[PDB]
Design a protein around this ligand. Structure first.
Ligand SMILES: [Mg+2]
Ligand SMILES: [Mg+2]
Ligand SMILES: [Mg+2]
Ligand SMILES: [Mg+2]
Lengths: 114, 59, 129, 155
């Protein structure tokens, strides 16, 4: 019932999440590779991210919005598959802002696996 | 890192976003695993030397 | 004015005599009806292949003498003989025959068995353990 | 490590229906190098198709092979454990060859009487998208659709 909104596309290296939300807080729908039905390691493939983006795009288009600001987050692999899925869905993409957390040399990261 | 689509075309927006995401992902992956201070300095100097040699050969 | 052709295949000679006639070609192999000489396993079309696409309405009387080979080899031999005799009548067929390559000896013959091998190219079973 | 592409021999048009696929399936049902026996099997099956379907045998055969003919192939690629499959589009020639091979393999296994009737009934069943080669094509298609994700990575 709202024309403009935000789409948070978080791409973890292990999984992906797409949350369609009102311009200020109050997420309106959400989807992820797990809710798609993919399980285990298949959740981290770009195709699963595209599937999740397509489902959420169809859902929110039937809900009836037009303009989307796409907030890209994380450092996965299928970071652009969701972008192309939304573009193919056809919602008016206005902004491509990226908001993956960057630190200013605070907090100690985990150990390096070997 | 906001980039405006400009509503004139879409491929241009992705062409810039590719870069912005690349230099973002560099630091994002740097701040993922813990290395000692000396090893971090060594890695920084190695990256700087690689970039320096590439620019020397490209200029 | 008769025409003579000599074809060969798989060690099977052929002598084809082409006679000008206008009362049906009536192909004949070694004084016997081809439908009885050959197994009639549609191999007849194989020998008629160069005489079909150009013509056989010219009703050439065919006198074939074949001595050697099996039946496919004999059919190939008489095909080559018919083509080579056809090169003696209106050489303009030579281009069209060469186009689809019915005027070249097949050159394929059975290889000789080699010692230590179960045949021309087969080898014994190899065990490692 | 060969860097050479193999040549291809002529397929030869069939000398009865003038359809190369007939010669191809003859060579496929070849056993013990018996061209006469294979040709007899095929032509008897086609005559039985005449007797049953009351339609053109060549048209029925084309309708069967086109329906059995697959689209995707799954190539096995092992890396660490088991094999993850890869869907690839096949050339038309290999497509037809696989269709004919499946047709013959599932024809020589049916419960019926002489192989004449065996292959004839297999062809008439595959003409209506209900058969064993149909099940094989369905299985490989569903497996590729399931493993659609790894299609991007081949090698
Ligand atoms: Mg860890
Ligand atoms: Mg240490
Ligand atoms: Mg032996
Ligand atoms: Mg052993």
């Amino acid at each position: 019932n709202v024309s403009s909104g935000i789409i948070h596309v978080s791409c973890s290296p292990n999984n992906t999440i797409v949350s369609a939300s009102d311009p200020g807080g109050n997420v309106l729908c959400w989807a992820s590779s797990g809710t798609m039905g993919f399980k285990g390691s298949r959740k981290k493939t770009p195709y699963s991210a595209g599937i999740a983006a397509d489902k959420v795009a169809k859902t929110v288009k039937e809900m009836g919005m037009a303009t989307v600001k796409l907030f890209v987050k994380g450092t996965g692999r299928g970071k652009d598959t969701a972008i192309r899925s939304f573009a193919n869905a056809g919602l008016s993409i206005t902004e491509i802002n990226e908001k993956t957390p960057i630190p200013h040399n605070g907090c100690k990261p985990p150990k390096r696996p070997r | 890192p906001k980039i405006e689509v400009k509503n004139d075309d879409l491929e241009l927006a992705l062409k810039k976003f590719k870069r912005v995401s690349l230099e973002i992902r560099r630091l994002a992956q740097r701040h993922e695993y813990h290395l000692r201070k000396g090893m971090r300095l060594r890695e920084k100097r190695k990256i700087a030397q690689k970039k320096r040699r590439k620019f020397r050969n490209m200029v | 004015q008769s025409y003579y052709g000599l074809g060969r295949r798989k060690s099977s000679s052929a002598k084809v005599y082409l006679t000008p006639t206008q009362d049906k070609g009536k192909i004949t192999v070694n004084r016997r009806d081809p439908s009885e000489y050959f197994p009639n396993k549609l191999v007849i079309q194989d020998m008629e292949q160069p005489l079909d696409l150009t013509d056989l309405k010219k009703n050439f009387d065919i006198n074939v003498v074949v001595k050697g080979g099996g039946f496919t080899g004999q059919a190939g031999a008489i095909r080559l003989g018919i083509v080579r005799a056809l090169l003696q009548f209106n050489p303009e067929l030579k281009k069209i025959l060469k186009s689809k390559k019915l005027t070249t000896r097949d050159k394929r013959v059975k290889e000789r068995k080699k010692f230590g091998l179960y045949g021309a190219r087969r080898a014994p079973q190899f065990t490692k353990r | 490590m060969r860097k050479n592409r193999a040549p291809k021999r002529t397929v030869l048009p069939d000398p009865v229906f003038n359809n190369t696929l007939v010669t191809r399936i003859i060579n496929v049902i070849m056993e013990d190098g018996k061209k006469g026996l294979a040709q007899r099997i095929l032509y008897g099956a086609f005559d039985l198709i005449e007797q049953r379907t009351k339609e053109k045998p060549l048209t029925v055969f084309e309708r069967a092979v086109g329906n059995v003919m697959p689209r995707l192939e799954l190539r096995v690629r092992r890396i660490a454990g088991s094999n993850y499959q890869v869907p690839t589009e096949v050339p038309q020639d290999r497509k037809i060859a696989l269709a004919l091979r499946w047709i013959a393999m599932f024809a020589r296994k049916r419960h019926e009487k002489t192989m004449l009737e065996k292959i004839a009934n297999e062809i008439i069943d595959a003409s209506n998208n209900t058969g064993a080669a149909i099940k094989k094509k369905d299985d490989t298609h569903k497996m590729a659709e399931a493993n659609k994700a790894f299609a991007h990575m081949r090698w």
